[PDB]
Amino acid sequence: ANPPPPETSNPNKPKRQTNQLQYLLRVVLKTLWKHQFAWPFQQPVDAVKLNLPDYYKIIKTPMDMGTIKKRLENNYYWNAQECIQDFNTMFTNCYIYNKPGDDIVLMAEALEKLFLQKINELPTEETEIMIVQA
Ligand SMILES: O=c1cc(N2CCOCC2)oc2c(-c3ccc4c(c3)OCCO4)csc12
Structure with a gap:
């Protein structure tokens, strides 16, 4: 039985925009989304359909x-580091649940490599922005 998906908003959680978060959305994620190995990671794991026994016991933070x-x-x-942590949780979840060299691990590893390449391009200093009419 799959849990509800992770929350994507929280009216009591402090929220902010920065140049780096902006770059993460409109450059990094856009580039990852079209990668040949994006498809396994574009939506929550459905452990029932994929036949992953004990997935939600082993993986405390699906992402x-x-x-x-x-x-x-x-x-x-x-800030950006908070978003980067979600990406890292997503990749490491895959490494935790599966075995080294498994096809899904190889795909996650390649996608992660591209991710790390793109976040190397982030603006050097993180500064707040406010795009009002966004
Ligand atoms: O940790 C994981 C383990 C595995 N498997 C699947 C079957 O072989 C055994 C292990 O799958 C995933 C996926 C995944 C894979 C394929 C998809 C998918 C998602 O969503 C959309 C349809 O195709 C994402 S993390 C993950």
């Missing part, structure tokens, strides 16, 4: 790019 995209669009994060 996916569909959720990260909504979180970015809803200005859910305080």
Whole structure:
């Protein structure tokens, strides 16, 4: 039985926009979304359909790019590092649940490599922005 998907907004969680969060949404995630290995990670894991026994016992924090995209669009994060942590949770979940060299691990590893390449391009200093008419 799959849990509800992770929250993508929180009216009591402090929210903010920065140049780096902005770059994460409109450059990094856009580039990842079209990668040949994006498809397994564009929505939450459905452990029932995929036949992943004990997935939600082993994986305490399910995460996916569909959720990260909504979180970015809803200005859910305080800073870029918080968003980067969700990406890292997504990749490491895969490494935890599966075995090294498994096909899904290889795909996650390649996607992660591209992710790390793109976040190397982030603006050097993180500064707040406020795009009002967004
Ligand atoms: O940790 C994971 C383990 C595995 N598997 C699947 C079957 O072989 C055994 C292990 O799958 C995933 C996926 C995934 C894979 C395929 C998809 C998918 C999602 O969503 C859309 C349709 O195709 C994402 S994380 C993950």
